Amino acid sequence: DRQPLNPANIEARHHGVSDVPRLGAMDADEPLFVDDYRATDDEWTLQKV
């Protein structure tokens, strides 16, 4: 939004579990919902390529 994301802003997304609060948050912008897979550096270079 405006401030750099303090890790409290970055949140994981659960899969298979009921997740209506995240689906409500779809329109919202300040929080970040991420997969629990911090991609490796080699994949990072490969994707950049």
């Binding site: 209506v20 609060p21 995240r22 409500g24 948050a25 919202a28 912008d29 300040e30 929080p31």
Partner: protein
């Protein structure tokens, strides 16, 4: 008056965990959608 059966007591002791887990998930989910819906 006497020591009673243990199976029914164990059933109630399963139901108490049934309530604690619901407590935990409900309070966590409530504070979470409170954070997302209103605190933004």
């Amino acid at each position: 008056v006497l020591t009673q059966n243990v199976l029914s007591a164990l059933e109630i002791l399963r139901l108490v965990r049934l309530d604690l887990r619901q407590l935990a998930q409900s309070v966590q989910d409530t504070i979470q959608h409170m954070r997302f819906l209103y605190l933004l």
